[PDB]
Amino acid sequence: KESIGEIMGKLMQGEIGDEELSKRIKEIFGKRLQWGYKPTHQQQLAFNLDFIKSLKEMDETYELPSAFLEAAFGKTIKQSGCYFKDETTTIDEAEEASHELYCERAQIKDGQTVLDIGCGQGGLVLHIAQKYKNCHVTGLTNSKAQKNYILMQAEKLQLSNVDVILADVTKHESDKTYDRILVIETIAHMKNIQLFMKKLSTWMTEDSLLFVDHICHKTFSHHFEAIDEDDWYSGFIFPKGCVTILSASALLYFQDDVTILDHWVVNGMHMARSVDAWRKKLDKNMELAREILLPGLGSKEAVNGVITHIRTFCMGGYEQFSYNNGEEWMVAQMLFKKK
Amino acid sequence: KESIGEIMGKLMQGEIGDEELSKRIKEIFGKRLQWGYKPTHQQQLAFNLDFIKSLKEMDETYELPSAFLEAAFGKTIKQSGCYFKDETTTIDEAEEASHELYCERAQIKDGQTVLDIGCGQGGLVLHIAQKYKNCHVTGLTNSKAQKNYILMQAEKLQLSNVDVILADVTKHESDKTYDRILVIETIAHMKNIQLFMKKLSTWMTEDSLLFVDHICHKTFSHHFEAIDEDDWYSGFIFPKGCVTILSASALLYFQDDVTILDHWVVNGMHMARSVDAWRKKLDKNMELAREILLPGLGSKEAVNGVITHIRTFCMGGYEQFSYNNGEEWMVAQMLFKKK
Ligand SMILES: C[S@@+](CC[C@H](N)C(=O)[O-])C[C@H]1O[C@@H](n2cnc3c(N)ncnc32)[C@H](O)[C@@H]1O
Ligand SMILES: C[S@@+](CC[C@H](N)C(=O)[O-])C[C@H]1O[C@@H](n2cnc3c(N)ncnc32)[C@H](O)[C@@H]1O
Numbered sequence: 001k002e003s004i005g006e007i008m009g010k011l012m013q014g015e016i017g018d019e020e021l022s023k024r025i026k027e028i029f030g031k032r033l034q035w036g037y038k039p040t041h042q043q044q045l046a047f048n049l050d051f052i053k054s055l056k057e058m059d060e061t062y063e064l065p066s067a068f069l070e071a072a073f074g075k076t077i078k079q080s081g082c083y084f085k086d087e088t089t090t091i092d093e094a095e096e097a098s099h100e101l102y103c104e105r106a107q108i109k110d111g112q113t114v115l116d117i118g119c120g121q122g123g124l125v126l127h128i129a130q131k132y133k134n135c136h137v138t139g140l141t142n143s144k145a146q147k148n149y150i151l152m153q154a155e156k157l158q159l160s161n162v163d164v165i166l167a168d169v170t171k172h173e174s175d176k177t178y179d180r181i182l183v184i185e186t187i188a189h190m191k192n193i194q195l196f197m198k199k200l201s202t203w204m205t206e207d208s209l210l211f212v213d214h215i216c217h218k219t220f221s222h223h224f225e226a227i228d229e230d231d232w233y234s235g236f237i238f239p240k241g242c243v244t245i246l247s248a249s250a251l252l253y254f255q256d257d258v259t260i261l262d263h264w265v266v267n268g269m270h271m272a273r274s275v276d277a278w279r280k281k282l283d284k285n286m287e288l289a290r291e292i293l294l295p296g297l298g299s300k301e302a303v304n305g306v307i308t309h310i311r312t313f314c315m316g317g318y319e320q321f322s323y324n325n326g327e328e329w330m331v332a333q334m335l336f337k338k339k
Numbered sequence: 340k341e342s343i344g345e346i347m348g349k350l351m352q353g354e355i356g357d358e359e360l361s362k363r364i365k366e367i368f369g370k371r372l373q374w375g376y377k378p379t380h381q382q383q384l385a386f387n388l389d390f391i392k393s394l395k396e397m398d399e400t401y402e403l404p405s406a407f408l409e410a411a412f413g414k415t416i417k418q419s420g421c422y423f424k425d426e427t428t429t430i431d432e433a434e435e436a437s438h439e440l441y442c443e444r445a446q447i448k449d450g451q452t453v454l455d456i457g458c459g460q461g462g463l464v465l466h467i468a469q470k471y472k473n474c475h476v477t478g479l480t481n482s483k484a485q486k487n488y489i490l491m492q493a494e495k496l497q498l499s500n501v502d503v504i505l506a507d508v509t510k511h512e513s514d515k516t517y518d519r520i521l522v523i524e525t526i527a528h529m530k531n532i533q534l535f536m537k538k539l540s541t542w543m544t545e546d547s548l549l550f551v552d553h554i555c556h557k558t559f560s561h562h563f564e565a566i567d568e569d570d571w572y573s574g575f576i577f578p579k580g581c582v583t584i585l586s587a588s589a590l591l592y593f594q595d596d597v598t599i600l601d602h603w604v605v606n607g608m609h610m611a612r613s614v615d616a617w618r619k620k621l622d623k624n625m626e627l628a629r630e631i632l633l634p635g636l637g638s639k640e641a642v643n644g645v646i647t648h649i650r651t652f653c654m655g656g657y658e659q660f661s662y663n664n665g666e667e668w669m670v671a672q673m674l675f676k677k678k
């Protein structure tokens with residue numbers, strides 16, 4: 001069936017079954033792979049360097065209710081890839097394992113000041129604060145709801161070492177420095193990477209470390225947007241075209257102000273299992289979710305719309321991160337010091 | 340035929356024909372590829388990062404006569420990969436094309452001070468000096484013979500803007516700075532890369548650029564040494580185990596003191612065609628070469644030994660750089676500024 005509008009129409013009517021939906025999104029990702037892989041390393045580097053150089057030239061009131069977030073995501077409402085040891089690891093255990101991975105790779109130690117940039121619902125902030133009672137942990141979010149959620153959770157867990165800065169990170173100005181800065185799956189939303197990294201360095205001292213985790217492709221970078229008129233998916237998921245997927249090594253070229261100390265990647269099956277867990281939990285709590293959303297949304301059809309958007313994101317994320325057994329799209333992690 | 344000694348024995352007797360020699364070296368390189376490629380990007384990065392971290396912990400009077408060098412190499416005696424536009428490009432034309440490539444990518448402009456580190460027989464120094472009469476061009480070499488050769492060539496070409504520093508680059512101390520620093524296929528011999536790059540930065544100002552060209556593997560780094568007891572080749576060619584082949588991206592992790600601006604690779608068929616041209620020219624001038632070498636060598640057998648070493652280097656280099664149509668071993672190039 002041709003035509004964006006036609007596919008979008010059937011999709012919203014629940015007339016496209018899971019199997020065909022998955023098959024359709026997978027073919028969309030297959031075409032991005034064809035766009036991204038060049039025949040020789042000479043050409044691959046030319047293409048990658050052109051993307052990086054273009055980056056270096058660059059310079060909604062409605063928020064889902066937290067009770068809905070609790071019904072779709074895991075216990076700490078982590079909205080980033082989790083780490084699954086087993087086949088039977090639950091989303092709650094995978095959330096905790098990923099928190100501990102970050103603490104290990106970012107070399108968190110009791111006593112440090114820690115800043116978590118774009119902290120979301122604050123799972124990582126709460127984890128570090130609870131495990132390391134002499135750390136002072138600051139979250140930074142541009143969401144008032146997120147701030148209020150984190151502060152409430154801190155109060156319930158009897159944590160006294162948590163604060164939250166409410167700010168757009170690109171506009172925030174401050175003299176404060178921190179021993180540790182964490183940036184977990186936020187960089188994909190950052191429009192000016194060179195400026196972002198530069199600002200981060202001014203919040204560091206000679207003893208600080210910076211840890212960044214970002215969704216990536218192992219070989220090439222791309223904007224998350226349609227290649228052609230056959231791709232209904234990209235523009236449905238991110239209607240504002242400002243999500244960038246950096247290659248696993250792209251940040252190596254942004255060492256004006258920071259210097260790399262270590263670099264890892266985590267296979268895409270972890271992310272795939274994450275989104276699959278959210279999809280399954282959402283499906284299980286579907287009735288409850290629709291009831292929670294109805295008030296603030298107004299119509300049963302607007303509810304259906306928000307649910308379709310979220311569920312399709314999950315189905316598409318599955319196909320993207322599980323491609324070739326997790327060896328295409330994945331998560332890259334880097335550790336830096338100030339330069 | 341098993342046993343290192345046995346193969347080494349036949350090789351020196353000219354009893355191993357070209358076809359079997361090539362086949363044997365190619366299988367040796369095949370095994371290094373098996374050693375170097377990991378099943379997942381997560382493992383490949385772990386392996387690459389381990390090599391880079393190990394680097395960061397690390398801290399002959401007999402010279403061939405220039406008349407011999409003239410009989411084996413091209414007109415400027417370039418001893419680095421050349422650039423072949425055609426099938427019929429000669430070694431002399433490929434030397435010139437590669438010189439012009441370096442000048443373009445290093446952004447050489449008339450009027451600049453230029454330093455060429457490990458300048459060899461000074462082909463690049465003489466090229467820049469002749470093309471850009473207002474540049475002052477300094478070569479640095481640890482070889483007295485090379486210095487004397489370059490100065491003589493400068494005198495014959497009526498060049499007044501050439502000087503040569505005789506020094507071990509790792510020990511050279513100086514307050515002088517340069518607009519442009521070039522390092523062409525020298526880094527593979529450098530034992531302490533982090534210290535090397537740091538020193539280079541002290542010879543730069545805020546306006547300087549640094550261009551590095553190095554032999555590489557596209558995916559992984561390795562020392563040029565035997566994996567196992569089946570590899571007679573590595574230890575025959577470099578009897579001192581201190582040649583490192585960095586991956587194409589290894590230098591990205593050495594930005595403590597310099598910051599990357601651009602990055603390229605040149606397909607390995609260019610290098611392969613280079614060594615093939617040297618081998619063919621040596622074979623053509625074989626009689627003349629043996630006569631030139633005899634004086635300073637003393638015996639016809641020591642002559643035969645030096646020729647076998649050089650010719651086998653060429654045959655092995657062919658198999659290494661032409662592997663998979665030049666898409667394994669190749670040449671990487673980087674441009675940096677001071678940090
Ligand atoms: C993909 S979520 C990851 C959240 C959290 N770190 C986690 O791992 O669950 C990225 C977060 O960045 C926040 N964000 C996006 N742009 C921001 C900006 N300019 N300033 C601050 N936060 C921002 C979003 O609100 C969102 O909470
Ligand atoms: C592979 S040759 C390349 C020569 C020249 N750049 C070219 O492209 O033909 C590398 C050169 O580095 C020189 N070299 C090696 N170690 C050196 C050191 N520590 N200081 C100075 N020169 C060195 C060698 O003598 C040799 O001439």
Ligand SMILES: COc1ccc(C[C@H]2c3cc(O)c(OC)cc3CCN2C)cc1O
Binds near residue numbers: 078080224317
């Ligand atoms: C609507 O806001 C959200 C954005 C992202 C996620 C999950 C996950 C993720 C999963 C994807 O597959 C993806 O596409 C490339 C992007 C992202 C962004 C980083 N991360 C946290 C959850 C959200 O609720």
Ligand SMILES: COc1ccc(C[C@H]2c3cc(O)c(OC)cc3CCN2C)cc1O
Binds near residue numbers: 418420652656657
């Ligand atoms: C004996 O000294 C020499 C060393 C190297 C070359 C040619 C060429 C090259 C070719 C190879 O295949 C190789 O192996 C990985 C290493 C090198 C070193 C860099 N370059 C200049 C020529 C020489 O005369």
